[PDB]
């Protein structure tokens, strides 16, 4: 679908104009869940290797949380970019096409004839 929009430079994970958006806050609930995923990998990582799960290689799972958080963070900015982009050119289109978006008439519920079905 944004597959061929004008200006999309290929192989650009985060285009420069995306910087005009509010960056994800460092404790965004989506981000901490991404950090959860890093930790959850750590516990099982000692499980396959048959290590004392929780208290086993504090260095190992510590790196997992760091890696998942950053890769999560850049993903969230990119994710926020498209949704902002998807809504942006959306709005630019509807103003450019007034005839295809009529303003529906303002009638209150008093004049609307909605038939009533009893439950009996």
């Amino acid at each position: 679908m944004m597959s061929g929009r004008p200006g999309r430079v290929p192989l650009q994970f985060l285009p420069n104009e995306a910087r005009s958006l509010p960056p994800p806050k460092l404790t965004d609930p989506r981000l901490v869940y991404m950090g959860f995923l890093g930790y959850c990998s750590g516990l099982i990582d000692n499980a396959i290797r048959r290590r004392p799960v929780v208290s086993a290689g504090l260095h190992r799972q510590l790196l997992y949380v760091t890696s998942f958080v950053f890769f999560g963070y850049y993903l969230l900015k990119r994710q926020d970019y498209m949704y902002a982009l998807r809504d942006h050119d959306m709005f630019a289109y509807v103003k450019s096409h007034p005839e295809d978006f009529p303003e529906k008439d303002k009638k209150t519920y008093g004049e609307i004839l909605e038939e009533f079905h009893p439950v009996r």
Partner: protein
């Protein structure tokens, strides 16, 4: 095979698939497919057993035929348009021509007959490469040319893929044949949504990638190829059987596990495209995959099959493998549903 030779052979196979995804010229698309084929056979030949020779021969004949049949689709499009650019092509017969040509490479329609047998003959590691990496290249062409496809022709091919792929899965003992039948079933899910919106065709791809890496490398870690052989693994390492049943449930698509994310989004898309009977039937056939999924889960960890006294040596020793990327694989393959709106990144 010498590891340096093995590394190069994989390197070309990866580059050949990479070549397909990065070529704007139809000839180069074919170049990637053939040279990926040219190096796929020796990897299947690494074990060099008569079963493998039968498997590799079967794989080469179908892939070479599909690739050769692919040339006419390029030539006919050339003949009627004089365009080597990979875009919306300009001939219904040529469009039809390549669609089965690529489908045979993926193995969705009756074309799928090579997919199970080749996996059975060749080693577990080779099967992992064949069923995961070798599916990116044919999909790459379909994504680019999705706008030209006949909707009826592609939806059918997707239907029999999940239909037959799930149906025969109930009658498989060998885990390798189970995985391939699962692969054919999963092939239909991505291919069905392909004409409508390619974004979640990709989303299904990486997700379906995750379990198959998760399952196969778990199976390699188990060093088991049959259902009974898998059953004995509870005694040695009960924990691994526990994760496998999570992935087995996840790959089946039960919420909130990751495998539900593709199917849910797939149903949502064609529902937006007014196609509402089509999603319903695939969902009904989705339980067919879940059945032998449960049967494996019943045999693996949910129950406790009898073991053999010779298992006692396995307790004393330990695994020497490093199962690289296995920790993050299953976690990314079982609980990522809350991170669903990240699919817009693919767009």
């Amino acid at each position: 095979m010498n590891p340096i030779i093995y590394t190069t052979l994989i390197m070309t196979v990866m580059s050949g698939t990479m070549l397909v995804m990065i070529s704007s010229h139809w000839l180069l698309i074919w170049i990637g497919f053939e040279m990926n084929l040219l190096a796929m056979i020796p990897v299947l030949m690494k074990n060099f057993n008569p079963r493998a020779t039968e498997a590799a021969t079967k794989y080469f004949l179908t892939q070479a035929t599909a690739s050769m049949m692919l040339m006419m689709a390029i030539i006919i499009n050339l003949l009627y348009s004089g365009q080597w650019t990979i875009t919306k092509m300009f001939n219904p017969v040529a469009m039809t021509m390549m669609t089965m040509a690529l489908a045979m490479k993926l193995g969705l329609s009756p074309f799928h007959f090579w997919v199970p047998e080749v996996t059975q003959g060749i080693s577990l590691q080779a099967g992992l490469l064949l069923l995961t990496w070798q599916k990116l290249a044919p999909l790459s062409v379909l994504c680019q040319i999705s706008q030209s496809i006949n909707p009826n022709l592609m939806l059918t091919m997707a239907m029999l893929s999940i239909l037959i792929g799930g149906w025969g899965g109930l009658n498989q003992t060998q885990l390798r044949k189970i995985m391939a039948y699962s692969s054919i079933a999963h092939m239909g899910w991505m291919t069905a949504v392909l004409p409508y919106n390619t974004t979640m065709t990709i989303l299904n791809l990486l997700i379906y990638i995750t379990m198959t890496l998760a399952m196969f490398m778990l199976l390699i870690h188990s060093s088991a190829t049959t259902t009974l052989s898998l059953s004995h693994t509870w005694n040695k390492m009960p924990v691994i059987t526990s994760l496998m049943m999570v992935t087995l449930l996840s790959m089946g698509g039960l919420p909130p596990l990751s495998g539900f994310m593709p199917k849910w989004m797939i149903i949502q898309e064609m529902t937006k495209n007014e196609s509402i009977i089509m999603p319903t039937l695939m969902a009904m056939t989705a339980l067919l995959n879940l059945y032998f999924y449960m049967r494996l889960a019943y045999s693996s960890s949910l129950t406790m099959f009898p073991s053999t006294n010779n298992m006692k040596m396995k307790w004393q020793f330990e695994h020497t493998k490093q199962m690289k990327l296995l920790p993050t694989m299953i976690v990314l393959s079982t609980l990522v549903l809350p991170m669903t709106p990240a699919l817009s990144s693919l767009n």
